[PDB]
């Protein structure tokens, strides 16, 4: 029904993957540090309400008739829907509020990668909120009301809706398929693997940035798929691109989805072979991305793909090496990265008196 | 999870309980060969029988010749039917092709220009439409993607619209959903159990003058942008006055319960419910079946948000047109703008396994 908001870590990273996403990047419009801290406190208070299925402020109705309602009301009657709200800080935030010397070294700017076609309007951002829930209306309501609360101090830079599985009709254990029709998520870090999360996902105090202890680093990539091109490829071409078969999702030469891959049986430029930790010095990611389908473009093509989200302990040792290794990926024929942003995701809100960003702002 | 039967006197997806998700596509026809188009309709019908039963199209998604593209794109494998319905419609522009000019129904009226219209021509009209509704977005996208693929060379997608959540009801026994203005939308509609009301107001009858359309309906699609910044600063009282119902319960002004009958004289004269109500429009009644959308940001720091309004009716001239004309003075107009428009003739149902979409026309 709901996911606890408080903890050492923000929810929405290691907690169970919800059916739907609304991710928003915001830009900050105030120069006043005190004004921004006040916002973070008001947002935290709102998030406590939202994640428990309650309206923000004094509610969506029943207040003074002459006042705008505190909550815009489109989630009334809905359940918490396992809503999580996860905040992150972009590199550009640290050019404000005297913060330049507190930017973590682990929050690295991404290099340009071969084939990148990044839309500057759908890239970057001073901060992000990742809203995940089983009901898309719950997620949208959250973003819409945070944006409203922050009006005058932040604006929405870009926004992405996504979807994974529908849990009401799909067993939890079953691996979702992406829009290329392949199972996606088989070899990932699971929220159950506490030690692997410590190794690969959570920032530690000895990593160099104390305020980030218990936080993580997020890379977002909006990756368009060339659907109509992919759909004309033979079955064998598609399986060769990945190194797993399409039906069962087993590694080539193996029988079952979760059989461990034998990388040498895969083509040298197969996606799994290039992405696997063993090909990348042990680098391992927590993927937590969502499919998207936004409509059709001016050529009549489906505007669809993967909104890739990766969490890691250090961008320089997680996404960067793995993505660099995909330079010759067979998948590259069929995809294009068109949006990108990175964020530092702070530690959790410890209790009722804490607030988002408290370890940074002090 | 369950399947909705595909065959019947009427197409499913109209009187059917409203599903959670929409993917609507308008297509233009690129072939002038009547026989080629008829063969497409038949192949599409076959596919639809598979898809609505939760089966892959053609020979499947895998297990065929390795050197061939799979017949089904694969991304719905392991999913339930998820109440998928597929509803086809023919736009006025289709009747300029294939010797069909004299068979265009009079009830398929072109809309007049309405005050405030700002229609994008690229996201209006269409030779034909397919409305895919399902509780799982992935299942809806899969259906449209596979129909489009099958249609390659004979049809192109002109425009499409995804709806992330419903803002309509054909099931008064269940909770009425809310639109993004925070109001319940669908209280006084037509229920799928109200056979006499459907016969009166929704299905075309032989005597209406177009035999091939008997058992079909007419569809009006309107893409409506919502000025949420404007709306969100309005007082509670102003918002309730706009509609004539209270926000929390959705009762008519003065009354206690959502489903209490409106007393129209207690509403403001420009209240939406007052203007839209059948009693204000010579008895004209519609089956409303629309969905909410958000398509990112507007470029000005705000979330985009809208309603994709769908209405079914026995005759466009006696349904949508009179009602929309009466909304010329609607208080709601301050907060919305119609930016896309299309009309379609929705043919009768596919009677059995030997029948096909459009068979009464062709
Ligand atoms: C649209 C883009 C992409 C698609 C469709 C895609 C698809 C897949 C699929 C089908 C698998 C195999 C099943 C699984 O273990 O999840 C896989 C594995 C993986 N992908 Fe991708 N991927 C995409 C982009 C990326 C990107 C950008 C990265 C990282 C930079 C990435 C990293 C990985 C990793 C680390 C694995 C697991 C390899 C292993 O340990 O076996 N993928 N991906
Ligand atoms: C963004 C646009 C719109 C919004 C937010 C909206 C909202 C509402 C709401 C809150 C109600 C009251 C609950 C109900 O009975 O469903 C309602 C009723 C209704 N609306 Fe709208 N509506 C919009 C557009 C339209 C349009 C374009 C039409 C027709 C051309 C329409 C026709 C109706 C009708 C017929 C009723 C039922 C009136 C009655 O019989 O009580 N609406 N709408």
């Amino acid at each position: 029904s709901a996911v606890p908001f408080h903890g050492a870590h923000q929810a929405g990273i290691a907690t169970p993957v919800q059916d739907r996403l609304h991710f928003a990047a915001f830009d900050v419009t105030t120069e006043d540090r005190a004004a921004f801290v006040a916002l973070l406190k008001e947002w935290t208070a709102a998030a406590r309400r939202l994640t428990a299925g309650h309206a923000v402020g004094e509610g969506a109705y029943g207040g003074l008739p002459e006042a705008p309602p505190d909550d815009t009301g489109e989630a009334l009657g809905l359940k918490p829907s396992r809503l999580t709200l996860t905040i992150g800080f972009g590199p550009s935030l640290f050019t404000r509020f005297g913060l330049a010397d507190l930017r973590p070294e682990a929050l690295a700017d991404l290099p340009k990668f071969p084939g990148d076609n990044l839309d500057r309007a759908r890239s970057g951002g001073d901060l992000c909120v990742q809203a995940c829930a089983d009901d898309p209306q719950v997620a949208v309501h959250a973003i819409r009301n945070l944006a409203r609360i922050g009006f005058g101090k932040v604006v929405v830079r870009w926004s992405q809706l996504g979807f994974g599985k529908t849990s009401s009709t799909t067993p939890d254990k079953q691996t979702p398929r992406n829009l290329l029709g392949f199972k996606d998520g088989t070899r990932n870090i699971a929220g159950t693997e506490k030690d692997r999360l410590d190794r690969f996902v959570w920032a530690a105090e000895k990593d160099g940035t104390p305020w980030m202890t218990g936080g993580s680093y997020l890379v977002a990539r909006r990756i368009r798929m060339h659907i109509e091109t992919w759909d004309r490829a033979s079955l064998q071409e598609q399986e060769d691109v990945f190194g797993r078969d399409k039906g069962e999702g087993a590694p080539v030469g193996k029988a079952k989805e979760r059989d461990e891959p034998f990388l040498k049986a895969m083509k040298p430029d197969a996606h799994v072979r290039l992405a696997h930790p063993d090909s990348n010095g042990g680098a391992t990611l927590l993927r937590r991305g969502y499919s998207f389908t936004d409509g059709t473009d001016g050529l009549g093509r489906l505007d669809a793909g993967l909104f890739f989200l990766a969490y890691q302990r250090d961008i320089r040792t997680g996404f960067v090496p793995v993505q660099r290794n995909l330079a010759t990926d067979a998948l590259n024929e069929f995809i294009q990265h068109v949006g990108s942003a990175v964020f530092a995701v702070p530690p959790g809100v410890r209790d009722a008196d804490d607030w988002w960003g408290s370890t940074l702002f002090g």
Side-chain angles (χ1 to χ4, degrees), chain A residues 175 178-180 182-188 221 223-225 242 244 249 260-261 263 271-273 275-277 283-285 287 305-306 308 310 318-319 322-324 326 329 331 335 337:
Chain A
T175 310
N178 59 41
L179 295 178
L180 298 183
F182 280 74
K183 296 186 183 173
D184 196 333
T186 302
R187 280 176 43 68
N188 198 11
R221 307 285 279 200
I223 307 172
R224 172 64 186 285
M225 287 166 179
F242 282 110
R244 287 170 179 273
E260 288 298 348
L263 300 183
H271 178 72
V272 172
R273 181 160 174 187
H276 193 282
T284 308
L285 303 172
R287 295 176 286 143
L306 173 71
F308 182 92
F319 176 86
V322 179
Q323 175 63 32
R324 179 170 273 122
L326 299 188
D329 193 352
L331 183 62
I335 61 164
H337 296 230

Side-chain angles (χ1 to χ4, degrees), chain A residues 58-65:
Chain A
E58 302 185 45
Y61 61 97
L64 300 164

Side-chain angles (χ1 to χ4, degrees), chain A residues 101-102 104 203-215 217 347 359-360:
Chain A
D101 62 355
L102 290 172
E205 174 168 290
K206 71 167 157 141
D207 299 340
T209 304
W211 74 260
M212 267 297 292
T213 303
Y217 300 88
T359 63
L360 176 57

Side-chain angles (χ1 to χ4, degrees), chain A residues 339-359:
Chain A
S340 177
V342 297
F343 304 93
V345 174
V349 178
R350 294 319 300 257
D351 65 20
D353 292 316
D354 200 8
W355 42 278
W356 281 329
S358 72
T359 63

Side-chain angles (χ1 to χ4, degrees), chain A residues 63-120:
Chain A
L64 300 164
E66 54 271 23
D70 280 357
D71 190 292
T72 61
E74 66 274 28
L76 285 169
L78 297 184
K79 297 302 200 285
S81 207
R82 301 189 303 164
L83 178 69
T84 58
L85 293 168
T86 309
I87 194 169
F89 301 144
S92 53
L93 184 69
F94 296 86
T95 72
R96 305 186 171 258
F97 311 129
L99 291 176
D101 62 355
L102 290 172
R103 176 184 178 175
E105 284 198 279
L107 180 65
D109 296 310
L110 299 178
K112 182 171 65 179
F113 293 109
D116 279 353
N117 187 20
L118 300 181
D119 178 350
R120 305 156 49 62

